[PDB]
Design a protein around this ligand. Structure first.
Ligand SMILES: Cc1cc2nc3c(=O)[nH]c(=O)nc-3n(C[C@H](O)[C@H](O)[C@H](O)COP(=O)(O)OP(=O)(O)OC[C@H]3O[C@@H](n4cnc5c(N)ncnc54)[C@H](O)[C@@H]3O)c2cc1C
Length: 434
């Protein structure tokens, strides 16, 4: 039998977190990362559901010590003021133009702080990858996994070392290759979402004064997500340091030169546009895929996928890294139990498969509602009857519940509205549907 219990493809948040859980449990873990860290990567704003996982693997203190900007909350704004009839919803202080939350408004199990972080992902992924090594994981960088061979009793990772093929047998493979979906693509189980086909254009700016433009100065270090309903396009502002800010524009592929589209979109708000033009652009505009997909298989005999390698959803709720960390957590529990049973057949991962489906279905449905009736999202966040149940989702706490209270409530309102073209809210239904 192979020396190594588990071979991990990729050393981003999902891969490094998996390595840390498994190494801490005493399994022999080999991890292979194609790049050398640090390397640039989008996806910077965390939610607090990352916290219990960072504490589990004892990485929270290092992350806190690194000096990433603290994130106490989030704001979602829209260009649409919405209907005059608020239908009994309260807390809409700016019509339907603005919703805002602080994470500390709801007590979250395993979370001991009022804040999470926004992170330079180059630095964050390096920090976590070195941490995994310190836990006892065997980490390789500059070493790509080209394929997984299933011809033997145990899977073999075919890696590439200076143009040479190095075949590494392991008992169990974890694909944590992110959007590269290394194993899902090999197995041909990857299904692109017919509807969520987003792409992003984004960069960093230096010496843009977040606090100067903020309508609530105390909130200048929140993430801000601005929605443009008419063109189903969103715009992010994410703190990177005290002086650097990440700004991105996200839109359907069909709607997509690029530099001009980026700026015209930001120009929907002349003084943000101005402030950014007058700041220092510290990186080229980058355009990348942001499209949704799901694998029809996320596990099988001697393999499973975690993080983006398993599924992707539009990160309007800053969800991705929390899925990476929590899929790692849940998958690692099944792997440790499988190791204890001396068997890695598909059934060993039934719980991981169900929980991943449940949690990311919850995100997907939440995201669907945001797009389908955005004014209802705004109302549910703001109205104190529903705010806390909605905040549970926004905190990333989506693994608890096959049928979250807020999601079911919102779902039937969308239905009621869809099925009555007389509804005063009917005209606000968005074109992006399920
Ligand atoms: C535009 C955009 C904005 C986003 N914003 C946010 C946000 O605000 N908050 C948030 O939480 N999430 C966000 N996300 C999502 C987030 O970036 C991902 O969910 C996250 O990176 C998932 O981590 P991961 O470890 O699964 O994948 P990754 O972080 O991508 O890591 C995978 C690693 O695998 C390596 N790899 C790939 N193939 C191979 C191979 N064959 N062999 C070896 N190594 C390999 C790669 O080099 C990479 O380092 C955003 C995503 C996009 C596209």
């Amino acid at each position: 039998e192979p020396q190594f219990d588990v071979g991990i493809i990729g050393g981003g948040p999902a891969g490094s977190t998996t390595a840390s859980y498994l190494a801490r449990a005493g399994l022999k873990v080999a991890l292979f990362e194609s790049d050398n860290f640090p390397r640039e990567h989008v996806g910077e704003s965390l939610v607090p559901a990352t916290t219990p996982v960072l504490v589990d693997i004892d990485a929270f203190d290092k992350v806190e010590a690194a000096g990433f900007p603290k994130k106490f909350g989030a704001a979602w704004t829209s260009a649409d003021s919405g209907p005059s009839d608020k239908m009994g919803f309260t807390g809409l202080d700016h019509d339907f133009r603005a919703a805002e939350i602080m994470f500390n408004e709801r007590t979250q199990s395993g979370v001991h702080k009022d804040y999470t972080f926004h992170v330079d992902r180059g630095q964050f992924d390096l920090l976590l990858l070195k941490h995994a090594e310190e836990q006892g994981a065997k980490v390789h960088q500059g070493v790509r996994v080209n394929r997984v061979n299933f011809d033997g009793a145990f899977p073999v990772l075919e890696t590439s070392v200076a143009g040479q093929r190095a075949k590494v047998p392991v008992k169990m493979v974890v694909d944590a290759s992110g959007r590269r979906t290394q194993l899902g693509s090999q197995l041909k189980v990857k299904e692109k979402d017919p509807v969520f086909n987003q792409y992003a254009i984004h960069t960093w700016f230096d010496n843009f004064d977040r606090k100067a433009l903020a309508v609530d100065q105390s909130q200048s270090d929140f993430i801000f997500i601005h929605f443009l309903p008419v063109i189903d396009t969103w715009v992010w502002q994410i703190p990177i340091t005290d002086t650097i800010t990440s700004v991105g524009v996200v839109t359907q592929k069909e709607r997509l030169d690029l530099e001009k589209f980026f700026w015209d979109t930001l120009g929907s708000r002349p003084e943000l546009h101005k402030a950014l033009k007058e700041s220092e652009q510290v990186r080229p505009l980058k355009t990348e895929g942001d499209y949704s997909y799901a694998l029809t298989k996320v596990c099988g005999d001697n393999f499973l996928m975690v993080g983006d390698a398993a599924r992707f959803v539009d990160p309007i709720f800053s969800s991705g890294v929390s899925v990476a960390l929590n899929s790692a957590r849940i998958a690692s529990a099944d792997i440790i139990a499988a190791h204890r049973a001396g068997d890695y057949s598909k059934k060993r991962f039934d719980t991981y498969e169900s929980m991943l489906r449940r949690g990311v279905n919850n995100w997907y449905e939440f995201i669907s509602i945001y797009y389908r009736l955005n004014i209802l999202f705004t109302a549910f966040v703001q109205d104190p009857r529903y705010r806390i149940d909605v905040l549970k989702m926004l905190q990333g706490d989506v693994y608890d519940d096959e049928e979250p209270k807020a999601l079911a409530a919102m779902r039937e309102i969308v239905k009621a509205v869809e099925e009555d073209p007389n509804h005063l809210w009917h005209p606000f239904l968005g074109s992006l549907k399920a």
